[PDB]
Design a protein around this nucleic acid. Structure first.
Ligand SMILES: [K+]
Ligand SMILES: [K+]
Ligand SMILES: [Mg+2]
Ligand SMILES: [Mg+2]
Ligand SMILES: [Mg+2]
Ligand SMILES: [Mg+2]
Ligand SMILES: [Mg+2]
Ligand SMILES: [Mg+2]
Ligand SMILES: [Mg+2]
Ligand SMILES: [Mg+2]
Ligand SMILES: [Mg+2]
Ligand SMILES: [Mg+2]
Ligand SMILES: [Mg+2]
Ligand SMILES: [Mg+2]
Ligand SMILES: [Mg+2]
Ligand SMILES: [Mg+2]
Ligand SMILES: [Mg+2]
Ligand SMILES: [Mg+2]
Lengths: 262, 118, 206, 153
RNA sequence: CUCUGGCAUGUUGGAACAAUGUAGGUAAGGGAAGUCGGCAAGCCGGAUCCGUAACUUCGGGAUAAGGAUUGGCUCUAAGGG
RNA sequence: UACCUGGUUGAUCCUGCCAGUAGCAUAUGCUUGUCUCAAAGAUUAAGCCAUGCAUGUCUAAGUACGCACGGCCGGUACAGUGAAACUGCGAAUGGCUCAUUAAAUCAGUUAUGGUUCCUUUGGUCGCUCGCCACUUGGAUAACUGUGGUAAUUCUAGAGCUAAUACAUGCCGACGGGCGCUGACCCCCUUCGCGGGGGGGAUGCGUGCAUUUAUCAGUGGUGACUCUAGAUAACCUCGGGCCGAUCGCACGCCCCCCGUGGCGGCGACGACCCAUUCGAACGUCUGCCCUAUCAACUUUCGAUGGUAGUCGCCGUGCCUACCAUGGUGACCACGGGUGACGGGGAAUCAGGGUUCGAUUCCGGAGAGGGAGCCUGAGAAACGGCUACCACAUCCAAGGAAGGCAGCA
RNA sequence: GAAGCGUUUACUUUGAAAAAAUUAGAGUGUUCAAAGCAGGCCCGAGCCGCCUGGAUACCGCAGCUAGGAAUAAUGGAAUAGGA
RNA sequence: CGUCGCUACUACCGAUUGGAUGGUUUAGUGAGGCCCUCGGAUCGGCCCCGCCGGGGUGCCCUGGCGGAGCGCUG
C-alpha cells in the first residue's frame, strides 16, 4: 500500500469481538487510541453486540452524539473509540457502570460495577523515565502519562489511579506471591498469583502463575498485569473469578444448570 | 491564447505553469500543467489588447470617462475603514461602516450592513 | 532519480538480482551539497516526514571549540588544507564532515588574554597599546590579582599551538555535517592528532 | 606498525587525549584512557581489548556497535579479509517424504575484532547479531574457542 | 624543417596564360547507372581503452569485424639513487 | 471400504503395458417441475474501448456586504436559512488484475541500543528577564464589468472585499534568581608584610528544540556513545516554539468608584515527549524444472577496511584511497516456468500426488518505460511532464487521452 | 535467594507465542440438511424481564523455555604447557 | 529378412553470409524532470523632500498632486 490502512475486513477482525460473517464485509476498524486495535473494543460493538442498546451502525451513532457515554471520566463521541482493558464505561443517564475486563475465555465481558468503584482505575506502568529539568515521568499501559510519580514505582507495576484527577492514589508493586491477571495469549483472562519470575537476558521474561484451584501456567512478562496485593484483588472480579476450567467441567455445569432449570 | 509577462518572444511557447504563475489555475494542490502562452511583445497577430489609461487628457471620452462606477462594496476590516474615514480611536467605529441599501420590487426596502472583522 | 536501494547491486555470491518493483520515493538520493567557502548561502530541502534539512552551499563562519580550554568561539574559516577522503576536495575548497581547515585565532586570543592575562600570539609587544596596556595591568585588587596567578601555574600552551597563534591561523577539524545541519562546527587540533596532520600536510608539500 | 596507517586519524570518540597536560602532571607518560564496555549476555570482555591500543569502531567492546538479536556459533573457514572473517554453519534440513535429513551449510561473513589475536582456521566462534556493518556483514565475533588444540608441535 | 659542409635548379633565357596535353587538386545532388572488368581515383590508416565470428593442420584466422578517445593549460599521485 | 477386471497363448504361469473403474474441474451435448445456498471474461489478448457513474466534504463553534430567501421593527457592525468562493481535510483507503518476480515475493521468528510517522490518547504551552497590544500590514477569491478562442473543467485585462489563507509583531508574568566579570567597602591572625572570609555598584549570558566541544555520574538496560545534569558557545531571512483565532449561556468586583478589572464551559491551534495506526530496511530457516548450464563475480562495486557524500536511518547506497577478496558438486552461476507467495483445495489406510488467476494476509501494476509536484504518507496514474505504441476533435492554428474500477 | 555448570550438540517430553476464514469437532430442531452463530424460560399482561453460547483440537520445518540423558556425534591429562 | 517400385504421414540435413517475432545489452544521439551557477520581464518599500504646508511653536505634526531619491533594497 501507499499509506495508512483505514479499513478492517469482517473476517480479519479480532476473534474476541465475536462478530459474525453475514451482516457485512467490513469491521468497525477502531480509531487510534490508548489501546492497540487487536486488544480493544470499539464502542460500536459494545453498544450493539454486548448490550444490544443499538441495532445498526447509525443507531449507535445517535447515542454517542447525545453524549451519555463517558469513558474513563470523559465523554467520547467517537463511534469507533478503542475502549481497551479495565476502562470505566460510565453511562450516567442509565446509571450503569462497566469495567472492561476479560472473561475466563480471553474475551471482554460485560462487568457491571458500582458507581463509587468506578471513581478509580488500575494501570500498568510500562516505561519509567526522567524528563527535562530532572522531572520523572511515567507512562502506563494506556497512552496516559503522568509526571512526578512516587520513586518506588518501577516498570511493569500497577498504579492505583483515580478518575477526574489523573493522580496516583496508590500503587501495587510487582513481586512474588501477588495476584495478577494475564492480558494476552493462550492464558489470557486467567486470575492467579505469581509463583516464579524466570528471566532471560536479551529476550522476554517468563513468569509462572498458580490460580486458586492450583493449576499452574506460564506466560510472558508483557502479558502480566498485577491487580491485587498478594491475594486480595483490588477490583470486583467478573463472574467465574478468572478461573480456567477445561472442556470437561463446563459441560457438566450446563447439564447441572439445565437440570436445575428444567 | 493569453499573453504572459516576461516570455520575451513574439509568438507562442509552452510553459510548465505551476501554482499562481498566470494563465492557469491548478485543479489540485501541487499540480503543474504545460500550457501554451503568448509572448509579451505585441504585433499584428493579436485578437485583443488590454490597455489601461494612467493619466487624463483634455476632455472626456464618450461612454468611457463618465458615469463613474462605484466600488461594489466598502471596507470590512476594522482598520481599512479607519484609513478610509480617518477614524482615530473608538469614534463610533461600528456606525461609520458603509451600509449598503437593498431595493427589490417584490419586497420592502431595507439596508444591509456587513460584519466587521478585527 | 538517484536511488539508494540495495536491489540494484549484485548479491553476495555475485549473481544478478532482478528488481521486483520500480523505484520508490523512500529510497531516493539527492545531489551532494558540495559546500564551498564564501558568503552564507543555505538552502532548505524538505525531507521524509515533512522535516527540514539545511543544505549549506557556502559557509564562511563556523563554531569551533578549543576543547583543552573548554573555549568555543564563533570564528571564520580561511581555507581547507587536508582531506582524508579525496585530495580533490581540498583543491576545490570543500567543507565536509572530517576535513581539517584553518580558522582565525583572534577570538581564542581575546579569551586567552581576558582569562590568563599572558601575551599570546604577540611577537614583541607594545603595539596595540590602547587596549593591551589595560588588560595586563587592570590595577586590580589583592584577591583578583591573587585570583589571576592561580590561573597562571596552569597557564601554558603547547609549542605547536603557540606557533600557530604567531601565524594568526589555527587548523581545526570539522565535527558537524554541512549539507545536513547547514553549519560547520568543529574542534581545534591538539596533541598527537595535531602532529599527525602536520606530518600529512608536510608530506603533501614540504 | 602503530594504529595510524591510513589517511585519517583514529581515536575512540568518547576519549579526549588533550586533557590539558601541564606542569602539574608529569609529561610523560600520561597513558591515555581506553573506552571499553561490557556487551552483556554473560560474555566477558577480553583482556586484549581492555588494554590494547588498536582502534576499531566496529569492535563489540571498543566500538560503537550493540549486540542484540540472535546469538549463534560457527566454524572459521577463511581469514583473508581485513578485520572480518567468513564462518561456515552446518545444519540438517528435514524432509518429511523420506523421513530423513539433508546436510546444508550457510557461509556468514562476520567482523573479527583485533582483540582476538589467537584465531586460526577451524575454530569455533560465537557471533552476535548487530547493525549492518558492511554489505553482507551483520554479525560480530563475541567469543573464540580453540578447535581441540591449544598446543602446537 | 634546420646547423657544419656544398650548390645554383641540372645543355638556354624573356614575355604571355589560347586550344590540346603531361603532373596535381576541388566539385552541389545521386553513388558504379560508367566499363570487358571499380581501370583510375577515392575510403581506411598512428597510438590508448574496449571488443572480436565462421572455420582450423589448434599454431592461426586477428590490426578479424565493430566502438570510444586523442589539442592546449594548471595540477595531483605512482614508479629511483 | 487398505478392492480390482478385459486384452499377447492351441492351452498355462509371469513381466508388462493398453483398455476398463471412481472422484473433482473446465467445456460441451440432451433434458429439466419445486425450493435454499451459490461460482461466474482467470486460462487465449496485463489486447482495444464509445457512453454513464465510480471522491467528496460545514458544526453553535475559520471567512457571507449574492437578494437567492427571510425575521425587519425603524435607526442598528453581524437575526436566521444560506448558493458561490477562499480556507482545512480527504482524494496514498477501497475496488480490479496476476504481467513481472525463483532467497526475489511470501510464511514463521527476531531487531531497529540503526529510523520516520497525519491522526487518536496523555503530557507541555507566564519555566526565556528581553506612540497598535482594547488587535498591526498587503493582496486575493467569490462578486460587478470588458472580452479572446472552432474547441477544453482555457482563461486576460479592470474594479472591490475578508481569514484559523499569507505576513508582521508586542504587553504580560517580571519581583528577581543563577553563573561569569568584578568599582569599592566591611570584619579579620593583625604588625612592619601576608592575611581567612563576607557583602557588593557596573557590564555579559540565561527556557525548550538544533549543532558542536568539554566535565561529572537522578533514574534505565543484558549491554548506550541511554535518559537526566554542569560548562563554553552556535542557533541557518525559501530562517523552530514561546496563541493578534472561533462559539455558548451570562455573571462577580466595586474601595479606587461608575468604567474598568475579573471570571466557567468548550472548539481550533501548536515546538517537543509518550501512545496509536503504521511504514521501511534488516536476523535465522524454508521454493519448482534444468549440468545438451561447472565454474561465476570483479575495467562498469565484485568482497572487505578507512574517511566522507547521500538517505528518515545501519549498510559499497555512492565517491576517494587501499587490501584481493566473495560464491560454488551440501549444485554456485546461467536458463525455463503454461511461477504472484501464503492461509488453503482435490484425492484420501498409512506415506504421498497434483492444485492454489480466485473474496483473508503480503507483494506488484495501472498501454510500455522514465522523471517529478503536493502531502505525514505516492515515484500516485479516476495527479502532472516527456518519449514510444495506439487513438479522439479541429475552422488544420491547436486541443484532449488511459475501464488489469462498476456496468 | 543471588552466581556458574564439574563440555557442545543432535534426540525426546513440557510450556510460551503462533490472524481469521477453511479442517476436525462441543452446544444449538434452519420445519430436516447444506448452512448460521445463534438461542432458551416463563407472561397468571406488567415478565414495569431472566438465563446462556459465540468452545476445544491441529498448525509441518525454523526460532524461544524448562525437565530426561538411553542411543549418536564431539572434546579434557602424553614432550604434561595437567587438576 | 532386406533392397527395389507406388502412395500417404512424421521429423532430419541443406546453399540461400534465408526470413519473422520476442528478450538482454555495447556505442552514438538524446526529450523531460530535478539540483547547482547565473539571469533579471516585471512588482513593491525606504530615501518622499520641486510644493503648496506648517506645530510641539525659516526650526514642517502634515491634508495630497507632483518631479522622481536618477540611489539603498526586498
Ligand atoms: K601567349
Ligand atoms: K559497375
Ligand atoms: Mg474574527
Ligand atoms: Mg625548375
Ligand atoms: Mg638555370
Ligand atoms: Mg648534367
Ligand atoms: Mg560530387
Ligand atoms: Mg556529395
Ligand atoms: Mg553496369
Ligand atoms: Mg553500359
Ligand atoms: Mg587500384
Ligand atoms: Mg576475415
Ligand atoms: Mg583534455
Ligand atoms: Mg506469470
Ligand atoms: Mg493466490
Ligand atoms: Mg502502483
Ligand atoms: Mg496533510
Ligand atoms: Mg505512474
Amino acid at each position: 500500500a501507499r499509506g495508512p490502512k483505514k479499513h478492517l475486513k469482517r473476517v480479519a477482525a479480532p476473534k474476541h469481538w465475536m462478530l459474525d460473517k453475514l451482516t457485512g464485509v467490513f469491521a468497525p476498524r477502531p480509531s487510534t487510541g490508548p489501546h492497540k486495535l487487536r486488544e480493544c473494543l470499539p464502542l460500536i460493538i459494545f453498544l450493539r453486540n454486548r448490550l444490544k442498546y443499538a441495532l445498526t451502525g447509525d443507531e449507535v451513532k445517535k447515542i454517542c452524539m447525545q453524549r451519555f457515554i463517558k469513558i474513563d471520566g470523559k465523554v467520547r463521541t467517537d463511534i469507533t473509540y478503542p475502549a481497551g482493558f479495565m476502562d470505566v464505561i460510565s453511562i450516567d443517564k442509565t446509571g450503569e457502570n462497566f469495567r472492561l475486563i476479560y472473561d475466563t475465555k480471553g474475551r471482554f465481558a460485560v462487568h457491571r460495577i458500582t458507581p463509587e468503584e468506578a471513581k478509580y482505575k488500575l494501570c500498568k506502568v510500562r516505561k519509567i523515565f526522567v524528563g527535562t529539568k530532572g522531572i520523572p515521568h511515567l507512562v502506563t499501559h494506556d497512552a496516559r502519562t503522568i509526571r512526578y510519580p512516587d520513586p518506588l514505582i518501577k516498570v511493569n507495576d500497577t498504579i492505583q489511579i483515580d478518575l477526574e484527577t489523573g493522580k496516583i492514589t496508590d500503587f501495587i508493586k510487582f513481586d512474588t506471591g501477588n495476584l495478577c491477571m494475564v492480558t494476552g495469549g493462550a492464558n489470557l483472562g486467567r486470575i492467579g498469583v505469581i509463583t516464579n519470575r524466570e528471566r532471560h537476558p536479551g529476550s522476554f521474561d517468563v513468569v509462572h502463575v498458580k490460580d486458586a484451584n492450583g493449576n499452574s501456567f506460564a506466560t510472558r512478562l508483557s502479558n502480566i498485569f498485577v491487580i491485587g496485593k498478594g491475594n486480595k484483588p483490588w477490583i470486583s472480579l467478573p463472574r467465574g473469578k478468572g478461573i480456567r476450567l477445561t472442556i470437561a467441567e463446563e459441560r457438566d455445569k450446563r447439564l447441572a444448570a439445565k437440570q436445575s432449570s428444567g | 491564447f493569453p499573453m504572459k509577462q516576461g516570455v520575451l518572444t513574439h509568438g507562442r511557447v509552452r510553459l510548465l505553469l505551476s501554482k499562481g504563475h498566470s494563465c492557469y489555475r491548478p485543479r489540485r494542490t501541487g499540480e503543474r500543467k504545460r500550457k501554451s502562452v503568448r509572448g509579451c511583445i505585441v504585433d499584428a497577430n493579436l485578437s485583443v489588447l488590454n490597455l489601461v489609461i494612467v493619466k487624463k487628457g483634455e476632455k472626456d471620452i464618450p461612454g468611457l470617462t463618465d458615469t463613474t462606477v462605484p466600488r461594489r462594496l466598502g471596507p470590512k476590516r476594522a482598520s481599512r475603514i479607519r484609513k478610509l474615514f480617518n477614524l482615530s480611536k473608538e469614534d463610533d467605529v461600528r456606525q461609520y461602516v458603509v451600509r449598503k441599501p437593498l431595493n427589490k420590487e417584490g419586497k420592502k426596502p431595507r439596508t444591509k450592513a456587513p460584519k466587521i472583522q478585527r | 532519480g538517484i536511488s539508494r536501494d540495495n536491489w540494484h547491486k549484485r548479491r553476495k555470491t555475485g549473481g544478478k538480482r532482478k528488481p521486483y518493483h520500480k523505484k520508490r520515493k523512500y529510497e531516493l538520493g539527492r545531489p551532494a551539497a558540495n559546500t564551498k567557502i564564501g558568503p552564507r548561502r543555505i538552502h532548505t530541502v524538505r525531507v521524509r516526514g515533512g522535516n527540514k534539512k539545511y543544505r549549506a552551499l557556502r559557509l564562511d563562519v563556523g563554531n569551533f571549540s578549543w576543547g583543552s580550554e573548554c573555549c568555543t568561539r564563533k570564528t571564520r574559516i580561511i581555507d581547507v588544507v587536508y582531506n582524508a577522503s579525496n585530495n580533490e576536495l581540498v583543491r576545490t575548497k570543500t567543507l565536509v564532515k572530517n576535513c581539517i581547515v584553518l580558522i582565525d585565532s583572534t577570538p581564542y586570543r581575546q579569551w586567552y588574554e581576558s582569562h590568563y592575562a599572558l601575551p599570546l600570539g604577540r611577537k614583541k609587544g607594545a603595539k596595540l597599546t590602547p587596549e593591551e596596556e589595560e588588560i595586563l595591568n587592570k590595577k586590580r585588587s589583592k584577591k583578583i590579582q591573587k585570583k589571576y596567578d592561580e590561573r597562571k601555574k596552569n597557564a601554558k600552551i603547547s609549542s605547536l599551538l603557540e606557533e600557530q597563534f604567531q601565524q594568526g591561523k589555527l587548523l581545526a577539524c570539522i565535527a558537524s555535517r554541512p549539507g545536513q545541519c547547514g553549519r560547520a562546527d568543529g574542534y581545534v587540533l591538539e596533541g598527537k592528532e595535531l602532529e599527525f596532520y602536520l606530518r600529512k600536510i608536510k608530506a603533501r608539500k614540504g | 606498525a602503530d594504529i595510524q596507517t591510513e589517511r585519517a586519524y583514529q581515536k575512540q570518540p568518547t576519549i579526549f587525549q588533550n586533557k590539558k597536560r601541564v606542569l602539574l602532571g608529569e609529561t610523560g607518560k600520561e597513558k591515555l584512557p581506553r573506552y571499553y564496555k561490557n556487551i552483556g549476555l554473560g560474555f566477558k570482555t577480553p583482556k586484549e581489548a581492555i588494554e590494547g591500543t588498536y582502534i576499531d569502531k566496529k569492535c563489540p567492546f571498543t566500538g560503537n556497535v550493540s549486540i542484540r538479536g540472535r546469538i549463534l556459533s560457527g566454524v572459521v573457514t577463511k581469514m583473508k579479509m581485513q578485520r572480518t572473517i567468513v564462518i561456515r554453519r552446518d545444519y540438517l534440513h528435514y524432509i518429511r517424504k523420506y523421513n530423513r535429513f539433508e546436510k546444508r551449510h550457510k557461509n556468514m561473513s562476520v567482523h573479527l575484532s583485533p582483540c582476538f589475536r589467537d584465531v586460526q582456521i577451524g575454530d569455533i566462534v560465537t557471533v552476535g547479531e548487530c547493525r549492518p556493518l558492511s554489505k553482507t556483514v551483520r554479525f560480530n565475533v563475541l567469543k573464540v574457542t580453540k578447535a581441540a588444540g591449544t598446543k602446537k608441535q
